[PDB]
Amino acid sequence: CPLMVKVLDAVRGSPAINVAVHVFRKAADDTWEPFASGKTSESGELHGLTTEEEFVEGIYKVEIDTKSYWKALGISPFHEHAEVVFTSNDSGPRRYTIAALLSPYSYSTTAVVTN
Amino acid sequence: CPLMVKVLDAVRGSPAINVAVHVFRKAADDTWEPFASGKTSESGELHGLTTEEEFVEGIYKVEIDTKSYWKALGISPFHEHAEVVFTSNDRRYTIAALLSPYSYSTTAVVTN
Amino acid sequence: CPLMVKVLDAVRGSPAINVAVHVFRKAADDTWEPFASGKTSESGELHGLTTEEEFVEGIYKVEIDTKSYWKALGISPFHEHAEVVFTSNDRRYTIAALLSPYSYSTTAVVTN
Amino acid sequence: CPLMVKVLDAVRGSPAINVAVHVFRKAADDTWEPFASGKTSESGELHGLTTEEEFVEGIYKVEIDTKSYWKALGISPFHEHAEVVFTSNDSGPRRYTIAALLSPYSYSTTAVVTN
Ligand SMILES: Cc1ccc(C(=O)c2cc(O)c(O)c([N+](=O)[O-])c2)cc1
Numbered sequence A, D: 001c002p003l004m005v006k007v008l009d010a011v012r013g014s015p016a017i018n019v020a021v022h023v024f025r026k027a028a029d030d031t032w033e034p035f036a037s038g039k040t041s042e043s044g045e046l047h048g049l050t051t052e053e054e055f056v057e058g059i060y061k062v063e064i065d066t067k068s069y070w071k072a073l074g075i076s077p078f079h080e081h082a083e084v085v086f087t088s089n090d091s092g093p094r095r096y097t098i099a100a101l102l103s104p105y106s107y108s109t110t111a112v113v114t115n
Numbered sequence B, C: 001c002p003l004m005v006k007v008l009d010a011v012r013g014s015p016a017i018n019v020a021v022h023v024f025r026k027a028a029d030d031t032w033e034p035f036a037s038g039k040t041s042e043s044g045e046l047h048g049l050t051t052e053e054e055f056v057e058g059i060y061k062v063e064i065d066t067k068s069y070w071k072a073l074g075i076s077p078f079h080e081h082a083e084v085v086f087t088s089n090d091r092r093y094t095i096a097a098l099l100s101p102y103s104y105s106t107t108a109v110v111t112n
């Protein structure tokens, strides 16, 4: 799989488990169409979202349902979600890890792109 | 102004100057309607986007054009932009973003 | 003042108020000598730690007492403190720290 | 191993490879004594620093030589290093991952503590 999503919890110091993740691809009509989704595992990781065959160059959106996660922990959050929007680029083989570190009023995201 | 946006550059250790910022508000038909826009100043700050009267309850999206920023510095970054989406239930909101080519962070400082 | 420290709370979305900050400078014998200290204000900012004349070239450590901050809020955090160690080769330095119980970030904004 | 260190590069979007990492334990004389060290792998990870037998409750410092890393990339950095100082706590089994995300003028660190 060319795309992994990993979510961590900065309040509890733990993987963020059972977080819903939705991936969209930008369509020619310039709207976001759903592509793949899942929930993070006990390790905070979400594997198997797509395939090398399916994950062609394009503009993608990864939406992480952070609000439902904090609501389940009883902590008032600021953001409705975390979005990561990026253009994929075939240039040799590549794997993308989208990692997000969550706090109730802050999040960070980084992309680790490896061969 | 109840909303201010501050953008910093974690590569240069400087304010991120002249960054385009667009604010949208979700309408009754669930579409994103344009609300306000501007550019960050020499201090990295964008003041005066809206007023207390205009900034009613609702769901807002702040879109920071980080890609154009990095490309102007010769860097091809990962993200198309940095988004912040939030509900206002009411206060002053500062939306701060810290930028690197393959990472960004955003935090909200909400004071009264 | 050439050095200002700003501390924010990523759980509450607020400035981190009354946080203790200690600054050290490395001496010729490679020991850390105390240089200045203070507490963050209601804005999360600590101004006036030093002066242009006192803040000479050298290696500095800013130690932010994040543990006492979280414990006062009922949280047992991971880190004993947040450190920033840097060389001044000269300018205004803003050292900003964003705090969560098991994570912190720090950035330097260096302007002229 | 109860302690892992992982370092990522936010400029290149990659693991931070060959970064030196030094671990110290606070001694009774209240000075930092070296305990373990190594360099990050191609995955940005440093495994095998210590053992469950050796890693007793105490105050630890993890020092990451970020300055040498940025100097090797030709990018002027702000920090001399990144330090993570923490007290370990036996409370059921525990593994600590200390993760650091590096930029030339900024770094973040988080602890992922799992069973
Ligand atoms: C934005 C951000 C900053 C730090 C982390 C972070 O702590 C982390 C931890 C891991 O175990 C790990 O494998 C990765 N990774 O490979 O992306 C990141 C995660 C996200």
Ligand SMILES: Cc1ccc(C(=O)c2cc(O)c(O)c([N+](=O)[O-])c2)cc1
Pocket: A106, B006, B008, B094, B096, B097, B098, B105, B106, B107, B109, C006, C008, C094, C096, C097, C098, C105, C107, C109
């Ligand atoms: C996500 C993140 C992390 C760190 C910063 C940050 O470093 C920062 C720096 C400032 O000078 C400053 O005035 C503020 N602020 O007002 O909140 C934040 C900004 C954003």
